[model samples]
Target chain A: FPELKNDTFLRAAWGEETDYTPVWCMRQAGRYLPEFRETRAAQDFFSTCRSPEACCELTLQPLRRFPLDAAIIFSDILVVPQALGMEVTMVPGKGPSFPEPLREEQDLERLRDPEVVASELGYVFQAITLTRQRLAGRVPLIGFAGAPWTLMTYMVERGGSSTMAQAKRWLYQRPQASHQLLRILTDALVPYLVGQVVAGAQALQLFESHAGHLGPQLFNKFALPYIRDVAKQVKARLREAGLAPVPMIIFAKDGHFALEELAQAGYEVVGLDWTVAPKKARECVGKTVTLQGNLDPCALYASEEEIGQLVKQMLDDFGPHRYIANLGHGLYPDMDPEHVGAFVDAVHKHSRLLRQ
Target chain B: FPELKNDTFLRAAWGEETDYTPVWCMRQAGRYLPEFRETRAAQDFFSTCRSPEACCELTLQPLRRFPLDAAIIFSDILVVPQALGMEVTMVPGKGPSFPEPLREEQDLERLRDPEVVASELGYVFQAITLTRQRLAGRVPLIGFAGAPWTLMTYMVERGGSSTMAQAKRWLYQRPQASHQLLRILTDALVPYLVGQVVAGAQALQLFESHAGHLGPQLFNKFALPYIRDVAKQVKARLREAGLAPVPMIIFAKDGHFALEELAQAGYEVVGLDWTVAPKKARECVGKTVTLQGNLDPCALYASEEEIGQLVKQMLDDFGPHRYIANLGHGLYPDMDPEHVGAFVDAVHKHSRLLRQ
Candidate 1:
């Protein structure tokens, strides 16, 4: 709402030349920070998410430590499913769990109507608005949701899986039911994401974290269509509301095979996991859209000097234009915070060096 | 050895034409069989592997039910680590566990010399010999070990990991030690693999199940050299022993990024996971080496008829020559034996039909 201080991330997202590559880490405000853990201890995981003050505090915590180019809203992807009336609980060491997962066509009756989903996620919207007002436009704010197929994977498989066998079974055995669930998710996500933008979120990302589990055919059939529709409809909604549409990112973790298609799937930026080579990803996506991420998150486990060197090589590979610096995936819980600063500093230092 | 009844698997591995696609499942002698479980119940997991009779019985159990083209030895990948003097325990449902994992260069002293690793694994050689003799050439017998990089992961990380962060840290911080450990694994693997060939294994596979955790740079530096060394040294050892080297297959479970290098890394067959498209994989490796595998193991969760259709499509995509029909990974313990039969039957039926 106020005059922005840094628009490098926004410019890079739209494939514009930036003075230096913008930098941010996914899950930057996470368990890695001692302050984050103390705040998290004050409330349960979802309770923290449901409280606007708590969410705003966590979103800004990362910025207080590092000169990050952007701050993503503090919320879990499971919020969409929770809004659809799926009960989600966070077990201590284990991640999100659904006690009663949607297993059959009969289970579809239990979900809330897609039309009413946004009202249920008002806390997230409020958090975004509150965080924006507090920051006074220090950096762009990113809003995100789990992609339909990714959320369906959590709902059907019930939790984390090495092989998403139960979910893929739904695709092969109950094609109609699977489509209905995915479409329901798409409908719910479009409205929720649109609300975030109206409430002061700048850019948006769709995290298809489980995309690698499916090969090309299954992804094309189930995941890609909804991915395309979410972008198409979200942009259309923002335009109709007389608001400027923001750049969108599609991050399909380990979705190497889907890169070429994902690049064309109506997003301004495509996010890559560390396993994909930067040059190869550039070739797959071509030069029109901006590319973010691809440094191994584990690279932070090295020495501060080593982290700088790795970041230098990473920036060199991604090159000096139309790029944003970020880890291939999110920062892990055990990652050193100082090392994270090293990553941010190295990106700034190296990109400036590369330009000269 | 008596005249072989089915050399189609071996022929296909060498990029030779076969009457039909040679079909075998990785972990064909695994827990999916009731007989496997019953025999497994008779002894602890590693103890059963230590017994020639039990291993021989398990290998033959699958052949009795299905007209499989090959029988892989009943063994675990961790055996090489165990032979290298690491104490590995098979935790009931948690998969492999190394109670005292190798952490530093000083810890390396705990390992037996690589020269003695083959003798430490005498049970495996005996089991291979016994299973091969017991088969009486019913099908070509396959032998396998975890690749050096894969074994090193378990040794350093202590068990399975989603990130392999600690292990990769060793690459970044302890590069010399990582190489030392990898070379030790290579030295141990060469003799053990050569011993399997001498014991009558017609084919071998190296399972680099953790390959996906590394990108190109880390993989080329830490994984590839050891992968290349194992192949080179094993072939030389077999030649020196006046025994013909067996066709080797390399299945890097999630190593889609390393396919081209892996294809040229001196193996006859490149095994792929279901995540890789058959055509794109063919393009990566070119037509020189044979390709095995890549059906989603979860495809078995479909109806028997669905399995047939899926198999037909998979076969059609792979075409007729230089191909081996197998699941992208091993059959799961929960998978139905009937579905396994359907998979084998479908490959035979659809492949023969395609040829006609």
Candidate 2:
């Protein structure tokens, strides 16, 4: 096992400087690895997540192969739903298609009587705590949950959606009910993240995966406020406990128009997708927060020489400090693992020169 | 046909004033019309577009039901590929699916030979000319074409894509070749749209349908320049011929980040998708150029009372003077025609109150 040392990623995450901008990816430690897939041959998706040892093993696998600066716990955003007593399954080709989705008001009502659901969710915290212990203080482990609105998109849409039409229709048509649901999720999520901090997570990220679908009006009224609430509450809870305020990254994928609002919502880092210009985003969001990503993930399929040139371009685009190297989104199903290693090594090589 | 009599839509297109705001939807004339689908069923997809009279009738269908301010000639963006001797078909349930896609360099060579393709394509212009003559100085007919880069996406992907993976791979791996094809389409598109202008198009819109897929770096290199060229060349041609510079609208769908850049790219109106806040866009694009769109087209599905609120909100958001009330995009395939009519009537009724 490679020695993991320093909070290089945490320093970068908090918008502070280190030897170089530390790198990690959203789904860096998962199915993209053939070895990871082999281990999952017997266990179903949520089954592995429920097992702390298995989850920790998978989380550390990517770091073992590449000198990535961080390890995110192996988990699914939908695990929260499963804990809430709803059905969540990941079929091979169909992607997390739920059998009985929260179809109407009656469906949401069922969630009201569900068990002390957070206790059911304690396993995820256990996984994070165990993974951090296994890392032996090498690199920080990122603990995350779906942002309130994003979680509801799956809840309402039943699974992954092509355009999120049904979710938006319900959201636009019934803003009050949707907001009510968001408030409920907000109530659940704060306690959820606080528990992870208590367990051992060094930092937390709230992933708003469907932030791109709604217009700016809905974004402000729905997505941003809840995110602001989550960040504010997480920091306050940590500070009140006499604990250090952990760096929180608010990554709302494809929510380019809402970046300014999200920056104001008080995250240390604003995760950018490949669609944005990092320089322009820096101007828009200003120097208030560090920026991570904005590179297309497919660049992982390029030759080493191409990866080198592309990595230089990405580094140059952000100009220097207050940046972290990573792809815009998750690793693709067909990504060449060898190329990912080359891309990671190139990031290290280029970033070291950049810091110099 | 109703008397043109200084339609507010035409005046707005001219950047001049009127009593009320003009309104139109991008796919205003489409499958939502049972009449259109009926005619479309009589023949194969491309065959309908190939007949000047059939295309002209469908183009005017929206105007027959709703008091829309302008009529955009009905034509597919992919008509150019077919004219260039590529086989294109639209299956009943699926979108434009190309049998032989331009996957390699050899395909580029085949497309580069610009035969007197316009002679075969002149039927479209003939229809436009006929449609304009039929209007008899009533509503102005707007001409449109897919922006070069947007067309290249279709050409390279060989059809519509959910993520445009193939297109992105080509762009990252072989940017030089992609740029070569983009320039060719730009050169061809200028004349194609110019022929529409000659056939009596009063205004033009360049549809960058998938502009949001591209990151800023690629957007600037591949899309912005070509859009600028189209606007400049089309305007220069009109000015040289001693005609008024027809107002140009650039609808970069889901392209929320590029509005300010699009404003600078010489379009009079920057079209906003359903995802953008109109007030935010108006602030970004500035007061000089007008703003078109951005009501959720699905909002038309609501009751008459709800549509009234939606229309009022849109007017309040954009104001009546510098705004053209429009759906954020085309009407949905399953949308009710009565709902569409009600939505249009609401816009007209609400605009009168704003004007008064």
Candidate 3:
């Protein structure tokens, strides 16, 4: 594999023609890779994410093995909370957990200005700055943030949750305070993303991981507006830097009804989770935006022959012109690495056939 | 709290305008009420669900405390799985757990016919039958079945889960076989609902509890089609009996993108999980169909004055001509009974004010 030394992936992601479709994935450079795991086993989760050299090693690990079209900086979104002075940790088997939660207004008020907290995230900026040098012009790196609502879920719950009991109850029982926290988060996230872009991230994606939780009314009030604001701020920052707005992808996992809503936000690509129909999504969001993803990652479990055809069929459904081939969501940990190799090859092979 | 005699609840659920709207909930008769818990102290969950008189007692308990416009038959959906010989049990605090799940084809073949299973479920029908007699022309009793995909999730996984690991692995890996089980379950479910209708359930609400698990494509293929088939069969069965299509509500919890999918499936009312916007849902499904719900049940925890205003706001958002007031999903078991009373009264009081 060679470094993808240009913006070809971006050009393709923006619904423009390219010789080949660009491909990448969420958590593309993480624990699933055996070599990356060997490196990861040396350090606990948050420390590796915060360490520039280790983050670069982990981030570039995927590109080392495959002809990947993009490199996402190996970092966790909760890094922002840690920078904001919250105690966050990643426990093995349990996922990310926070020890101290900012459950009250005073806790939120502790951070007067998000930009001031940017100094605390010097390591993140250093990681991206260093990661770019190591890349030597492979695909551009992607910087990401958890949407306000998702971040709030972790902050308020102080960790990962299966039920989201406290977060949802707060939304209804304490709507005003909930909105206040989201507003402060909105203030914090804008500059954090801009800081990444300044460091070297050529594209940004807002990961609204729990977008499916809010019913329509609360989504309108809580999640959607803040998303629109983040995209709006990022684009404005890009303009200030005298560069064209970097392509934005809004990947709202399980946000089935917000398809049209997301199209109106200033993102160039709407990453469809496996739960969405790519064809129906294309119709809902319309022609201008490129659509990425939606193959259920679990489909890799199928035999090579079946996996190949399913890949071909998905390409046929979304077509090659304004689509990027990838899974609807991240890969499951135990997914066969050989199958992923075959699946990726099939995507390129079948996508070329569909083009003809 | 008086015995509900309003047929408006049923008519309103089907989009027909009446003097007042229908108001009932998916888990209206569950552990949320204090009385429901009091009964459990004496007997085990399955034993009580299988006892007709005990089931009827729970059904009427909520009505005693609040202005419930209708009552659902008190029984668990997994009772259908237990009938098929799956090792299903309800742990005291944990909900449903299965010791042996139908993980493979051989496991699924143990499934018995609906007639064989119906004998096991007779206590459910017996409860509905007895409850109808007790109501004696008061508010109608609604009957329901878990939509095939949802029930199969439990049958295959053999327990309760939020992540849906085993069920989804089978869904994405063995798509064909998953549909085969769905077909058999769908075939059995229609007759189950019809048997309840025959036993005196005046309305039917198919609870597609886990419909949100599939992204849009698989949901359309596996979940929606069967929901349509069941709705079609139930309607045809009603017509043959010279009864009007017993007004049906397809409450696919978290199936947000399937609003029109449910409407096209031939159901009269579209039940919106709290995630949907009342206005957006209206635009998708339109005025021809009525919408039931869009409220977060957690709103009950707010002060009664705020709850009243929120109810008025929801009524305004949905509009009177085609709305049925209900909670977004269900009452959480920890919810206060007095709050439940306030929530119900707020709907009636607020709607009456809006009318004036």
lDDT of each: 0.92, 0.81, 0.79
Worst 10 residues of 3 chain B by lDDT: B157-166
TM for candidate 2 is: 0.89
Model 3: per-residue lDDT, tens digit, B1-356? 13446788877876777765557766778787777889867788888987888988898888887778888888888888787777787776667888888888666677886556666677888988888888776688888888888988888874545557678778767778898888888877877887788788888888898887776666887788888898888778877887666788888887766777777778878888776777778888977887888678867777778778878888888887778888888778777777777778878877777777
lDDT string for model 1 (A111-178, tens) is: 99998999999999999999989889899999999999999999988665788888988998899999
Lowest lDDT sum, 10 consecutive residues, model 1 chain A, at A156-165
Model 1 per-residue lDDT tens digits across residues B86-132: 88888987778998887887898898889899899899999999898
| Model 1 C-alpha lDDT versus the unseen true structure | 0.92
Question: What tens-digit string does per-residue lDDT give for candidate 3 at A96-199?
Answer: 77877867656777655666666777788899889988898867888888899988888888454544667877887777888888887887888888888888
- TM-scores, all candidates, are 0.97, 0.89, 0.90
> Which residue segments of model 2 deviate by more than 4 Å?
A1-4, A112-115, A158-162, A233-245, A299-321, A342-355, B1-4, B34-41, B110-112, B158-160, B235-245, B283-288, B301-310, B316-322, B336-339, B342-356
- Candidate 3 lands at a TM-score of 0.90
Ranking by DockQ: 1, 3, 2
DockQ of each: 0.73, 0.48, 0.50
lDDT of 2 at B283: 77
